[PDB]
Amino acid sequence: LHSKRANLYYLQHCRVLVNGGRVEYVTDEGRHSHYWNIPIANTTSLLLGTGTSITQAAMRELARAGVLVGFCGGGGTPLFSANEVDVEVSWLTPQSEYRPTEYLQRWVGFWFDEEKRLVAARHFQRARLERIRHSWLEDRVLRDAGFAVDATALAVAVEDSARALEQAPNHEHLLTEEARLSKRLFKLAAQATRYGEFVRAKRGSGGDPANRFLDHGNYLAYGLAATATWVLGIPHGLAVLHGKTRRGGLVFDVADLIKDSLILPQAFLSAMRGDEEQDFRQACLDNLSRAQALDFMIDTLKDVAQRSTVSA
């Protein structure tokens, strides 16, 4: 169960089939695998990972019960394909088991008001600058990891960014402040890791291990955010901070919440230890799971809409 709120399960090394009107999993560990304790009801969703297959009859039964289905990648990220969630309105009232969502209405209810979009961007930036502190300071596991974070410089940069963010009149100023904070955090981590001078090459052209690690962590985080928006039911195009033209804006906006706080340390740690790709991927997944990122992304996304409707 990736998230307690979402009620989302992950399946691997298993064949899903039906025997006498009931969906059955066949996997090593026989009739003791804990896949038999998965409530099949309106309040469940299934994600199938590595080494898995699903029969047509099984998905007929799942549709009869009202369970969404999706095919994810190794470990839970990225998302390849899945079902779609319908909207809930006074009209458009079909008879089906699937439970519809309501957040698209509330989201669209303010996305057309520029100032409300500004408020939302402020909330996103505030969440990111908040989580950066916890990740970079409180983590005892990270402290034992080896990369040494100087409290003074990080506090100075976080306070400066907070002051700058509170005083951004238009979107472009907010983007400039974001870039400044990102560059400063990059520099601080580079100094902490002793890696030396580092940059964020365009096109992913950077040949240094740090570049590859950063790209891979980015890819994983984007996958996770895609899962988040799909679970909630909002579309990808309806960006909040990015420009209205840039496709997939909302995925990157939500992904940024955890990227600079989770991916950044791990890439430098791996480069210092000079580990291979598989171990780095496993480490990133483990850290994401422990930090319980997906829950935080979902909670923030609901909170924005709640505040927008309350202030209405």
Partner 1 sequence: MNILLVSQCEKRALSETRRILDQFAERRGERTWQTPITQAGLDTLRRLLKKSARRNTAVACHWIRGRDHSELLWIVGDASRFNAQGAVPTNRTCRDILRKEDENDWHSAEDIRLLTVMAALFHDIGKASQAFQAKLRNRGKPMADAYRHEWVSLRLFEAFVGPGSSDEDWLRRLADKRETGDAWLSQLARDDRQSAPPGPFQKSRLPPLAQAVGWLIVSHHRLPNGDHRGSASLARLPAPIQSQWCGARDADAKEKAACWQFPHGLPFASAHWRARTALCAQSMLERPGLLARGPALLHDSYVMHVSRLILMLADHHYSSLPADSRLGDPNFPLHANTDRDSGKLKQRLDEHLLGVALHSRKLAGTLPRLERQLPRLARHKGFTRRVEQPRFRWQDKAYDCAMACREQAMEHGFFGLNLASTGCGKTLANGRILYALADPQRGARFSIALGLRSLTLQTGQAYRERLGLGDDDLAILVGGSAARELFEKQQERLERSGSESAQELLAENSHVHFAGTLEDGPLREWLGRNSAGNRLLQAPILACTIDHLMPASESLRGGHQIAPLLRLMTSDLVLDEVDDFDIDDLPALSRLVHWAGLFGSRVLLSSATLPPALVQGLFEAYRSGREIFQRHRGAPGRATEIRCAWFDEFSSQSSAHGAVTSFSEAHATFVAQRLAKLEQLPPRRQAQLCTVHAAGEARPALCRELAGQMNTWMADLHRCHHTEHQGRRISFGLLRLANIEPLIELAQAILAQGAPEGLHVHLCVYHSRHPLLVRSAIERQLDELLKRSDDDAAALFARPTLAKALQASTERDHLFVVLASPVAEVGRDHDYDWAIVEPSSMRSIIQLAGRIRRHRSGFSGEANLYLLSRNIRSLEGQNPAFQRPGFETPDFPLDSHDLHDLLDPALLARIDASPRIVEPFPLFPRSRLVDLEHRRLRALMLADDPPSSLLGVPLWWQTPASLSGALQTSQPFRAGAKERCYALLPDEDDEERLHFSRYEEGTWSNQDNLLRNLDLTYGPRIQTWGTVNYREELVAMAGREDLDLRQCAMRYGEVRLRENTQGWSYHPYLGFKKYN
Q: Is residue 203 at the binding interface for DNA, with CB under 7 A as the rule?
A: yes
89 binds partner 1 (CB under 8 A): no
Contact letters for partner 1, residues 100-139 (x by CB under 8 A): ----------------------------------------
Q: Is 178 annotated to bind ligand?
A: yes
Q: Is 17 in the site for partner 1 (CB under 8 A)?
A: yes
Whether 13 contacts 52, CB under 8 Å: yes
Judge whether 291 and 262 are in contact, CB under 8 Å: yes
Q: Is position 18 an interface residue for partner 1 (rule: CB under 8 A)?
A: yes
DSSP 75-124: GG-SEEEE--PPB--SS-----SSPPB-HHHHHHTTTT-HHHHHHHHHHH
With contacts defined by CB under 8 A, name the span among 14-22, 99-107, 129-137, 162-170 that binds partner 1. Answer: 14-22
Q: Judged by CB under 7 A, which stretch of 119-127, 137-145, 214-222, 230-238 contacts DNA? A: 214-222
Rule CB under 8 A: is residue 38 a binding residue for partner 1?
no
Q: Could you say whether residue 247 binds DNA (CB under 7 A)? A: yes
Burial 186-222 (b: 16+ CB within 10 A, else e): bebbbbbbebeebeeeeeeebeebbbbbbbbbbebbb
Longest CA–CA separation in the chain, Å: 65
Q: Is 242 annotated as a binding residue?
A: yes
Q: What are the angstrom distances between the C-alpha of 102 and each of 91, 114, 129, 158? A: 13, 22, 29, 36
Q: How many of the other CB atoms lie within 10 Å of CB of 83? A: 16
Total binding residues toward partner 1, as defined by CB under 8 A:
15
Question: Does 216 count as an annotated binding residue?
Answer: no
Q: Which residues bind DNA (CB under 7 A)?
A: 13-15, 26-28, 30-31, 50-53, 73-75, 78, 200-204, 212, 214-216, 218-220, 246-248, 252, 277-278, 281
Q: Which residues bind partner 1 (CB under 8 A)?
A: 17-22, 26, 39-41, 55, 57, 61, 64-65
* Residues annotated in a binding site for Mn(2+): 178, 242, 256
